[PDB]
Amino acid sequence: MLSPADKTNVKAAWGKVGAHAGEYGAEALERMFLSFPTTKTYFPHFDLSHGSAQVKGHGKKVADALTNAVAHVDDMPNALSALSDLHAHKLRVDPVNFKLLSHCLLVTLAAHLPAEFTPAVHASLDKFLASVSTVLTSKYRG
Amino acid sequence: MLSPADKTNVKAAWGKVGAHAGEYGAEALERMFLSFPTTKTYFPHFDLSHGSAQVKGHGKKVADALTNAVAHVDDMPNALSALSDLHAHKLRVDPVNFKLLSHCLLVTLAAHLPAEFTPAVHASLDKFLASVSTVLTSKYRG
Amino acid sequence: MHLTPEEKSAVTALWGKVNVDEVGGEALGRLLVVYPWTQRFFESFGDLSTPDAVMGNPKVKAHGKKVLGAFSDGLAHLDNLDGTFATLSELHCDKLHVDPENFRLLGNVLVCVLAHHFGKEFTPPVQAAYQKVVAGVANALAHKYH
Amino acid sequence: MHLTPEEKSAVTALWGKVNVDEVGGEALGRLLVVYPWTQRFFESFGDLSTPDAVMGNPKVKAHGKKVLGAFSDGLAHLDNLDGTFATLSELHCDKLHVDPENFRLLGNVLVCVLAHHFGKEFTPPVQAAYQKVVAGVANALAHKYH
Ligand code: HEM
Ligand code: HEM
Numbered sequence: 019m020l021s022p023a024d025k026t027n028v029k030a031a032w033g034k035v036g037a038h039a040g041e042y043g044a045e046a047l048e049r050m051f052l053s054f055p056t057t058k059t060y061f062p063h064f065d066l067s068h069g070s071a072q073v074k075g076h077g078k079k080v081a082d083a084l085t086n087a088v089a090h091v092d093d094m095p096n097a098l099s100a101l102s103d104l105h106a107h108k109l110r111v112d113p114v115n116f117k118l119l120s121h122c123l124l125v126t127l128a129a130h131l132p133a134e135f136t137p138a139v140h141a142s143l144d145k146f147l148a149s150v151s152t153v154l155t156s157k158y159r160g
Numbered sequence: 161m162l163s164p165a166d167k168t169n170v171k172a173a174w175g176k177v178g179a180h181a182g183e184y185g186a187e188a189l190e191r192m193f194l195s196f197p198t199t200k201t202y203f204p205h206f207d208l209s210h211g212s213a214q215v216k217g218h219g220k221k222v223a224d225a226l227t228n229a230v231a232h233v234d235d236m237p238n239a240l241s242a243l244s245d246l247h248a249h250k251l252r253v254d255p256v257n258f259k260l261l262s263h264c265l266l267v268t269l270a271a272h273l274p275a276e277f278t279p280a281v282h283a284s285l286d287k288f289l290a291s292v293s294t295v296l297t298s299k300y301r302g
Numbered sequence: 303m304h305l306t307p308e309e310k311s312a313v314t315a316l317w318g319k320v321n322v323d324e325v326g327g328e329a330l331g332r333l334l335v336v337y338p339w340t341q342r343f344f345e346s347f348g349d350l351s352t353p354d355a356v357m358g359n360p361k362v363k364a365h366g367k368k369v370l371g372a373f374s375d376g377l378a379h380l381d382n383l384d385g386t387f388a389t390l391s392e393l394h395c396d397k398l399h400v401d402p403e404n405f406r407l408l409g410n411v412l413v414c415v416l417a418h419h420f421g422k423e424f425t426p427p428v429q430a431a432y433q434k435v436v437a438g439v440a441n442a443l444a445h446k447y448h
Numbered sequence: 449m450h451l452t453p454e455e456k457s458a459v460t461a462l463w464g465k466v467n468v469d470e471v472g473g474e475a476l477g478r479l480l481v482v483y484p485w486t487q488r489f490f491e492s493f494g495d496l497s498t499p500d501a502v503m504g505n506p507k508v509k510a511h512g513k514k515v516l517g518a519f520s521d522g523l524a525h526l527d528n529l530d531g532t533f534a535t536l537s538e539l540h541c542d543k544l545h546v547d548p549e550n551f552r553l554l555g556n557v558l559v560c561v562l563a564h565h566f567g568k569e570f571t572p573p574v575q576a577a578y579q580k581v582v583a584g585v586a587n588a589l590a591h592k593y594h
């Protein structure tokens with residue numbers, strides 16, 4: 019359950035992220051690759067070094083998908099349907115890895131939004147990313 | 161996603177369980193308490209020894225809740241809404257424990273339904289219990 | 303991990319009845335069927351498109367036989383699983399990068415297979431002993447992550 | 449767990465700047481807020497009804513100080529975390545029966561708190577070193593389950 023206050027908290031934190039969204043998505047990916055190196059095996063055709071244009075470009079895609087979820091928060095299964103097909107059917111992403119990226123997204127937000135990352139907003143963002151992760155793994159066993 | 165074939169598989173396995181449903185629920189609880197002893201701390205007012213009338217009575221409740229989910233498989237969040245409030249708000253059941261009981265339910269079905277526990281039906285039952293578990297933990301962070 | 307004498311008795315008595323040419327393939331096949339993302343690691347095995355294709359795939363059966371051999375090797379060394387599995391840990395962790403949650407899943411699938419094959423004989427106390435075994439194997443296989 | 453010299457450098461340099469009277473309470477409080485089932489273990493702490501009630505609860509702050517002390521004790525003994533945490537493992541595992549997934553959650557919350565406090569200084573390589581630390585602590589605290 020994303021409560022009304024959760025949706026308000028998530029919209030507000032994302033609003034403050036502003037046009038850094040893509041840079042932040044790229045940073046979250048880099049944190050994941052360094053912190054949880056098992057995740058790098060999904061990107062063998064990527065150069066994952068710092069400053070990589072491929073990680074930067076992909077971080078923008080991740081952020082745009084999250085922004086689509088924020089904008090359609092009451093309808094995320096439909097909004098994310100094509101992406102859940104991709105991650106489950108084509109890429110075979112292990113469900114455990116969505117918890118890893120979700121954590122690295124929270125860390126990135128905390129490192130960039132010192133006023134906004136209150137405990138209440140941390141909780142709301144955590145529920146939001148868990149909801150996104152539930153949709154993206156739902157074509158396995160949901 | 162519970163597919164049409166999943167719902168068919170789950171209805172058929174549950175149909176074969178028949179009126180053993182309550183006995184099987186009690187057995188699954190006993191398997192959980194012996195296999196994963198951390199789970200016993202939720203039942204301090206229960207005697208959890210073999211043959212306990214409290215475990216037998218509770219297994220019947222568990223089975224009736226699962227049967228309600230089978231009968232309303234396309235509407236499980238609504239069917240299980242009161243139960244999800246109980247487990248999250250009142251009992252504070254750790255989400256990890258639903259995976260433990262789900263496994264012990266699968267083990268119980270496998271030990272009792274040798275013809276029905278095909279790989280296809282095992283997969284379907286696993287998705288069904290993961291869907292039930294997702295609803296029952298959804299009042300935390302879903 | 304430490305099994306009590308009663309637990310070791312329950313485990314070893316059941317295991318002597320296991321068909322070691324089949325039960326490993328059944329467990330690996332069901333892992334690929336029930337948790338489909340694990341197929342990522344077995345692209346070279348060929349047809350995994352349906353449950354029947356997976357369960358009757360000869361490479362799944364042959365590789366499952368190797369997996370069960372490792373479980374058997376663990377059973378002979380319950381009080382020292384880390385040394386037994388060091389080579390397999392370096393393989394699965396350092397080289398394959400299999401997330402260790404999947405070691406737990408495969409252990410639980412094997413438990414389901416034993417319950418399917420042995421029925422009432424796979425009692426809740428027998429299951430509890432096997433859960434300690436498969437947890438110890440999964441922890442040993444993950445030791446290179448720790 | 450083994451940290452490289454560069455990892456140990458990143459960890460120890462940041463940790464010397466940590467306010468040890470506050471950061472533990474922040475991490476414990478956020479754990480209780482973000483993962484509400486953990487409140488099951490803290491009934492005696494009183495008012496946990498709102499985030500503000502949790503974060504300003506004096507028992508949460510005082511107990512969080514003890515938790516951070518254990519992390520600090522782990523940092524001094526990185527190459528031997530099991531012995532350091534044996535007593536805490538028996539407490540959390542044998543007596544409290546806390547599921548070990550929550551050790552991982554609290555470690556990750558602490559990482560979020562360090563990122564919040566240190567901002568850009570909490571670089572991705574610094575985070576990666578801390579992830580190895582909190583994983584080693586969580587594994588050591590769980591050792592009595594293994
Ligand atoms: C918040 C969670 C996630 C979001 C929002 C997300 C979003 C996306 C998007 C938008 C794309 C590109 C889609 C397209 O170009 O059509 C993508 C691709 C991809 N994702 Fe994710 N994803 C998430 C989690 C993950 C995780 C956890 C992994 C693996 C550890 C992963 C692995 C991949 C891979 C391998 C690709 C393909 C890259 C390529 O081949 O170019 N994703 N994701
Ligand atoms: C398939 C998953 C589950 C189902 C269908 C289920 C169902 C139920 C039902 C129907 C009740 C009684 C409701 C009532 O009397 O109003 C109940 C109570 C309870 N459940 Fe579950 N449950 C599940 C998972 C769990 C787990 C994993 C735990 C803890 C490890 C748990 C702990 C409890 C407790 C402590 C009670 C209260 C018992 C009492 O005080 O009498 N449940 N559950």
Ligand code: HEM
Nearest residue numbers: 340343344368369372373394400404405408409439440443
């Ligand atoms: C208890 C858990 C497991 C055990 C005991 C086990 C055991 C084994 C054994 C004995 C081999 C043969 C190694 C050799 O030929 O020298 C092997 C290979 C392999 N395993 Fe597992 N395994 C387990 C879990 C997993 C899981 C969950 C996956 C993937 C989801 C996996 C992926 C692989 C792969 C891809 C190979 C082939 C490596 C190669 O030939 O290059 N393993 N495993």
Ligand code: HEM
Nearest residue numbers: 486489490514515518519540546550551554555585586589
């Ligand atoms: C890295 C993870 C953790 C560390 C380092 C840690 C550390 C500690 C320490 C140092 C104490 C004080 C023990 C004493 O007074 O001698 C304690 C007590 C306690 N911990 Fe934790 N803890 C962790 C995780 C958890 C979690 C996740 C929970 C519950 C969700 C928990 C529940 C408790 C409880 C209930 C006590 C009070 C025990 C008592 O006074 O009887 N711990 N812990």
